[PDB]
Amino acid sequence: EVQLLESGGGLVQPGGSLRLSCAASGFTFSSYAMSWVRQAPGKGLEWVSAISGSGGSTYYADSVKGRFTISRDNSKNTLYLQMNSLRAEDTAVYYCARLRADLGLYMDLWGRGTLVTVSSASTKGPSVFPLAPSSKSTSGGTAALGCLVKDYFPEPVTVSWNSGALTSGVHTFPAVLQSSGLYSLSSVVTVPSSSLGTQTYICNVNHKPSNTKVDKRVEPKS
């Protein structure tokens, strides 16, 4: 019944700033202290900051001291983290965490996290190309069919099929950074070949970072 939900993740350039929010519900928000913990890509957890549940008591890791600024609004059940003068080093997922001091120190409830990217590159929306199912696999059994999401920055994109109506046989793969320092991925779905003749297939690709939501039909060629 009890949740934390992070928001306001985005790309920001060197010298830049950004405000992370964390919605709580299912407890008396003002009854407990809160904490920001970040996970750098392919590294362990690192504590950033924490704030007293009453409010007006703020502590910071020596890495973020005087650049970041914890805050909250108990009336609206929200924690925040104003981040100024961000450098590439600050790139990570930032998870808001309920802090409990009942005997010692432990964080008893986390959010789903939210990504912060500090690169001196530019947010780019994806190109979406249809994947030819199989010229051969047209007559018998089944055949794979998919969407290519190419040349988007930064992560993430989300893929659904026929607005999420089709999910049996769907497989969406992790992305990969090219040498051009740019992300691309694919999502494939397996349906019976006989159905392809008279069943429409459209992948829905949503890129929050450029707010591009492309719907792309996929059907066989000559």
Partner: protein, 318 residues
């Protein structure tokens, strides 16, 4: 009578810091001179063992910081028990309202049939788990109500507290700022209180008459007056951590204290939440401190007409 003065410099952290200067301010407002003038034998026990930190901030708050208070209250309760057994009435200068735990505890050890009058804008009847670890500025009554024990957790440093008082033995005056649970607790456990509405409804005079009919109606009992300074309207009491508007008039609070004196049963008094760093100016500080001095003094006899000091002389040049 005899009066014992106990400094109790409690605090929550940097945010509520300055409560330790809380007593010293009331002292520096000539508390001693005024109680002296009333004819009271005055033993001042200085300031009690503090609630400081080393590095400060850190995880002290929510771990070491509340352990410090819980035990500080233990020390206080010991001094109070000692002072009260020696026959003294106990004045306790604050400090945050948390010190009330120790004082009502230590008082109850020789005066087990004592009743409480709680003059405060708040009810300070939250638990440790029904609210943030904000140093129990509004949690001192839970530990002391025998009816609330099955809903309070044994905390580190509060192992020593045994519930002194029934729910039908504390009466509140001055309520203005009550949290949702507190109102529930008060209605649920059937605890009697008179807020600003009830004040405006019947007038201060009826409040004191009802209060005394409840607490000391059927048996004379020693009275514990816990006075929070926020109780007075913030125009009067501008140097308190959490000031609530629409508070008691100067005359109403003197009238309470005066009424309390006239029962004759006053056994101990707490004067708290008077942290003066909160003041914008010297005058704001001193005016609050000076108000405190008055409240204590009024409780121990100082009045508008006669002011004790009986005069049967009738001079002439006959």
């Amino acid at each position: 009578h005899s009066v014992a003065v106990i400094g109790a410099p409690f605090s929550q952290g940097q945010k509520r810091k300055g409560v330790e200067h809380g007593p010293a301010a009331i002292r520096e407002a000539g508390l001693m001179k005024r109680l002296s003038s009333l004819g009271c034998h005055l033993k001042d026990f200085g300031d009690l063992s503090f609630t400081p930190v080393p590095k400060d901030d850190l995880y002290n708050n929510l771990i070491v910081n509340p352990r410090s208070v819980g035990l500080a209250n233990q020390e206080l309760a010991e001094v109070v028990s000692r002072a009260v057994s020696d026959g003294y009435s106990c004045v306790t200068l604050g400090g945050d309202h948390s010190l009330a735990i120790g004082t009502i505890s230590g008082h109850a050890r020789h005066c087990p049939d004592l009743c409480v009058v709680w003059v405060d804008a708040h009810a300070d009847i939250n638990t440790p788990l029904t609210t943030s670890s904000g140093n129990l500025h509004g949690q001192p009554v839970s530990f002391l109500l025998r009816e609330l024990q099955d809903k309070v957790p044994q905390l580190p440093g509060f192992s020593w507290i045994k519930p002194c008082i029934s729910s039908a033995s504390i009466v509140y005056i001055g309520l203005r700022d009550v949290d949702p649970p507190e109102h529930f607790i008060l209605k649920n456990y059937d605890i009697q209180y008179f807020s600003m509405r009830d004040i405006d409804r019947l007038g201060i005079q009826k409040v004191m008459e009802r209060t005394f009919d409840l607490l000391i109606g059927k048996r004379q009992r020693p009275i514990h007056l816990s006075f929070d300074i926020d109780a007075f309207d913030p125009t009067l009491a501008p140097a308190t951590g959490t000031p609530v508007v629409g508070g008691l008039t100067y005359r109403e609070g003197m009238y309470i204290a005066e009424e309390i004196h006239n029962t004759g049963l006053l056994s101990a008094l707490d004067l708290v939440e008077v942290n003066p760093q909160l003041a914008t100016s010297e005058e704001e500080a001193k005016t609050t401190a000076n108000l405190a001095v008055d409240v204590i003094a009024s409780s121990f006899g100082q009045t508008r007409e006669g002011g004790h000091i009986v005069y049967d002389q009738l001079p002439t040049p006959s």
